[PDB]
Amino acid sequence: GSSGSSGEVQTDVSVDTKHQTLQGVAFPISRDAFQALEKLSKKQLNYVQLEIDIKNETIILANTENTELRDLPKRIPKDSARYHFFLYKHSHEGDYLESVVFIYSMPGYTCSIRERMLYSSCKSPLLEIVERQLQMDVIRKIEIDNGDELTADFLYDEVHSGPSSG
Numbered sequence: 001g002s003s004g005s006s007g008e009v010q011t012d013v014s015v016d017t018k019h020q021t022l023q024g025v026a027f028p029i030s031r032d033a034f035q036a037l038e039k040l041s042k043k044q045l046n047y048v049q050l051e052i053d054i055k056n057e058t059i060i061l062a063n064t065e066n067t068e069l070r071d072l073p074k075r076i077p078k079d080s081a082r083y084h085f086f087l088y089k090h091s092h093e094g095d096y097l098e099s100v101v102f103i104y105s106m107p108g109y110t111c112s113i114r115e116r117m118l119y120s121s122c123k124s125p126l127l128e129i130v131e132r133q134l135q136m137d138v139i140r141k142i143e144i145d146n147g148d149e150l151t152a153d154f155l156y157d158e159v160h161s162g163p164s165s166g
Contacts, residue, residue: 025118026125027052032061034129037085041134043098046087047075052122054115059126069152076147081106081119083126088139088155099139101155102127105147 036048049063062082067075072086084103089096104123108116120143130136140158144150 023117023121023124025121027122028058029126029129029133030056030058030060033059034133036061036064037130037134037136040085040087040100041130041136043087046085048085049082050085050126051080051082052119054118059122059129069155072155073148073150076103076105076144076150077107078147079107079109081108081111081116083123084150086150086155088159090156090159099159100130100136101159102138102141103150104141104143106143106145108145 047067051062086101088101142158
């Protein structure tokens with residue numbers, strides 16, 4: 001009979017403390033995978049399909065084809081978890097610029113928990129790549145549960161990092 005009664009059980013009212021992270025996986029960078037992000041830095045394309053290999057244990061290339069915004073969410077797979085680097089172009093203060101966005105779609109249907117956790121934890125060692133090689137930094141990280149959420153009304157939101165409720 002622990003439950004039932006409710007009151008001031010949290011006697012914190014003092015300094016708080018938090019961990020540094022939840023996972024800690026670091027996979028190597030493949031050639032094809034890198035070459036895909038390389039062009040992205042030279043403003044050549046606006047779509048990079050990357051993923052992690054469970055057999056090779058590394059971030060390899062999954063695909064590479066031009067993609068737009070109106071069809072951005074139309075390219076996202078509905079039966080495979082991978083990354084999608086979209087070049088969201090906007091005009092701040094009347095100045096048109098280019099920004100590389102990070103998208104991570106995860107369907108999660110049959111793939112074990114070891115694969116879904118390894119595909120979302122492999123982003124860490126994948127982000128430092130362009131941040132330690134191409135010297136390029138992502139405009140903002142975005143993760144969905146389908147891929148349709150990727151819209152000009154959503155992307156612009158994350159990129160802005162503006163305030164929100166929940």
